[PDB]
């Protein structure tokens, strides 16, 4: 934890706003705009109450009896609250789809931010690491849950300068009941997870490391760029996955980044998860200590590159 | 354009009934030909881009089939872009839901006889040069002894059904041979994958495993994990060692799941292997 006093402030200001609604129904919401496709998430207006929320829509046709079990497991998510976790408002079933309405983060995802910026500078990525490390510690220590799906598209930002985790794995029944999962072109799964052996939060640490390299260099780093491509700065899915399992992990270029930053990602991307750093080791790494004591006006950088 | 009046089966009327499931290949309705039939409704955006020509070819090929272990293909009418495929209706339970029922009692004899029937049906199809793409336990029906194969050759059609990221289920991956999983890539359609006679005998192995274990080999993982495990061949190596069943049983399971496709036996060979068993 190491809760600050101000974090209590903004926590409580959210938790005062919690009770400002009691029940939810489809017609409470008006589509404001489309955010992205994955499920699909929309910016929505709540009408019973002036709050503007993000409503993500996951289409599923499955029977009512299983649904009440998923939802009651999902109600536990109202319990987790952190300055590093997007606030949650409620869950319901409606018209062939569970809607999850949560805090709207006006900067979007780090993928769309990266698209706008081109590259993310080293100093911003330090503050992101601390927030992710503390979020994962919180989830481990208070609720005994690993995230399982850490990636840039699920790291959200706002103009206040908060950094929050989303889309983590709260419901064991929901994972098993989803028969039909979706694969895309980028994979952030750790090697040990891909081979189907025992895994823990260590696989999330790999995902954080790989996510950081992408954002630091501006490109998904598998396969590695060639010599002349790093200066300037058509593959099947199985070819990518086998690269992750058998080839050496990606690393940062040695010219343009500090040794603390290079060593940090290296410790995150050790393929053997027993040798990969754990949260306790990461919390004490030189890279985190430097970033933690640095004075960077994060709001100003975000507002100016995204054009407010 | 081909209509219902060109078919072996005398056609007069056909009434749609209640649907019984949707998939990426249209909607299937319980129908009534004086006998109940299965009607698969499709739409083809392929505005005469050899799709219909190919459809006319494949459908006429189905017309020359009849076997006690394969569904009776009856008719296929196309009033483009709306098409329909009429099949004989199989009563009873799918082999999927049958093997996973607690009250069901399968033994080394019941398991052998069931597999023989499936091999006999799959043998007929291969003899006719018809590759049964999409063979799985969900597409096999059992009714107090009678065993039927369903939905053969359906993947050869290029009808409309979606984005850039690939759309895969887990129940399907367990039947897919490594040659297919490796070629999978976004923007690629099912028609482009290397289904073959070998790909069918591989899927028969996953069926044979289901007949023993009453479940599929790979505990539900993220699809990405299931991809590498299968495409590398390591996944089937682990599950083969992880639990023993019998040298005779494991012989044919190791045979069908052979990584090098040419090392996979034919179905006629599999008939003999199932004989020399307990
Ligand atoms: C086979 C396999 O590995 N499945 C798997 C693996 C890891 C993750 C998921 N998973 C997921 O991917 N999402 C993403 C797609 C939106 C989820 O939202 C999602 C989810 N909701 C959710 C919860 C909290 C907040 I704060 C925001 C949210 F949106 N809850 C409650 C889950 O329990 C799981 C298990 C989810 C599924
Ligand atoms: N809570 C949110 N607030 C604001 N924007 C969001 C939120 N969740 C998602 N988005 C945006 O919507 C886009 C789509 O996200 P999403 O549907 O999660 O796809 P994905 O994260 O890549 N796949 P998955 O992690 O399984 O959901 C993201 O890239 C963001 O820009
Ligand atoms: N001849 C048949 N007799 C009885 N039921 C059938 C027959 N053909 C298909 N079905 C059922 O129709 C439904 C839809 O079939 P189908 O479209 O193949 O979906 P699926 O086999 O479960 N997987 P998919 O093919 O990817 O959609 C399933 O519940 C089948 O069991
Ligand atoms: Mg079917």
């Amino acid at each position: 934890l190491e809760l600050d006093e101000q974090q209590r402030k903004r926590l409580e200001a959210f938790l005062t706003q919690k009770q400002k609604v009691g029940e939810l129904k489809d017609d409470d919401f008006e589509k404001i705009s489309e955010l992205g496709a994955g499920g699909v998430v929309f910016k929505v207006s709540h009408k019973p109450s002036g709050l503007v929320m993000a409503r993500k829509l996951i289409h599923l046709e499955i029977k009512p009896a299983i649904r009440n079990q998923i939802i009651r497991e999902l109600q536990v998510l109202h319990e987790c609250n952190s300055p590093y976790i997007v606030g949650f408002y409620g869950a319901f079933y409606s018209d062939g789809e569970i809607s999850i309405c949560m805090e709207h983060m006006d900067g979007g995802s780090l993928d769309q931010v990266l698209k706008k910026a081109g590259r993310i500078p080293e100093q911003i990525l330090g503050k992101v690491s601390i927030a992710v490390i503390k979020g994962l510690t919180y989830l481990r220590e208070k609720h005994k849950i690993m995230h399982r799906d850490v990636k840039p598209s699920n790291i959200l930002v706002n103009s206040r300068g908060e950094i929050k985790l989303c889309d983590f794995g709260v419901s064991g029944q929901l994972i098993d009941s989803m028969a039909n999962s979706f694969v895309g072109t980028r994979s952030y799964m750790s090697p040990e997870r891909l081979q189907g052996t025992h895994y823990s939060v260590q696989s999330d640490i790999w995902s954080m490391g790989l996510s950081l390299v992408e954002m630091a260099v501006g490109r998904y780093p598998i396969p590695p760029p060639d010599a002349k491509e790093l200066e300037l700065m058509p593959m099947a899915i199985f070819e990518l996955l086998d690269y992750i399992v058998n080839e050496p992990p990606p690393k940062l270029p040695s010219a343009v980044f500090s040794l603390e930053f290079q060593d940090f990602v290296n410790k995150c991307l050790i393929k053997n998860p027993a040798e990969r750093a754990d949260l306790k080791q990461l919390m004490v790494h030189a890279f985190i200590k430097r970033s933690d004591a640095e004075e960077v006006d994060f709001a100003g950088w975000l507002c100016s590159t995204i054009g407010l | 354009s081909v209509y219902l009046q060109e078919w072996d089966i005398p056609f007069e009327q056909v009434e749609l009934g209640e649907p019984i499931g949707q998939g990426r290949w249209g909607r299937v309705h319980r129908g009534r030909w004086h006998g109940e039939v299965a009607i698969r409704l499709l739409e083809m955006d392929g505005h005469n881009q050899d799709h219909l020509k190919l459809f006319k070819k494949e459908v006429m090929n189905y017309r020359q089939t009849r076997h006690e272990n394969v569904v009776l293909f009856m008719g296929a009418c196309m009033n483009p872009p709306h098409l329909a495929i009429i099949t004989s209706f199989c009563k009873g339970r799918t082999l999927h839901s049958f093997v996973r029922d607690p009250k069901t009692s399968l033994d080394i004899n019941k398991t052998r006889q069931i597999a023989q029937e499936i091999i006999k049906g799959m043998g007929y199809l291969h003899a006719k040069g018809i590759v049964h793409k999409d063979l799985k336990s969900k597409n096999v029906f059992y009714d107090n002894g009678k065993v039927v194969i369903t939905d053969f050759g359906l993947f050869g059609i290029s009808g409309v059904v979606r984005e850039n990221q690939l759309k895969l289920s887990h129940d399907w991956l367990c039947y897919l041979a490594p040659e297919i999983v490796r070629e999978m890539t976004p923007g690629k359609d099912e028609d482009q994958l290397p289904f073959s006679k070998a790909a069918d005998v591989y899927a028969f192995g996953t069926v044979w495993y289901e007949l023993q274990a009453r479940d599929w080999p790979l505990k539900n993982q993220a699809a990405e994990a299931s991809i590498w495990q299968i495409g590398s061949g390591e996944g089937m190596k682990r599950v083969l060692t992880s639990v023993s069943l019998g040298k005779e049983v494991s012989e044919i399971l190791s045979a069908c799941w052979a990584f090098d496709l040419q090392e996979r036996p034919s179905f006629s060979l599999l008939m003999d292997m199932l004989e020399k068993l307990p």
Side-chain angles (χ1 to χ4, degrees), chain A residues 80-95:
Chain A
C80 262
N81 260 315
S82 167
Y84 308 120
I85 277 75
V86 316
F88 170 100
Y89 300 134
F92 58 96
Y93 173 89
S94 97
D95 70 280

Side-chain angles (χ1 to χ4, degrees), chain A residues 13-29 44-53 75 78 88-92 101-102:
Chain A
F14 189 69
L15 249 175
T16 285
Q17 203 89 258
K18 186 186 188 85
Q19 286 54 35
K20 211 196 171 61
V21 202
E23 311 309 345
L24 309 85
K25 254 201 202 71
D26 199 5
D27 299 313
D28 288 355
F29 299 92
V44 296
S45 207
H46 183 238
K47 184 176 178 181
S49 201
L51 287 166
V52 170
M53 19 181 81
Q75 281 308 95
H78 277 113
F88 170 100
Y89 300 134
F92 58 96
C101 308
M102 72 185 142

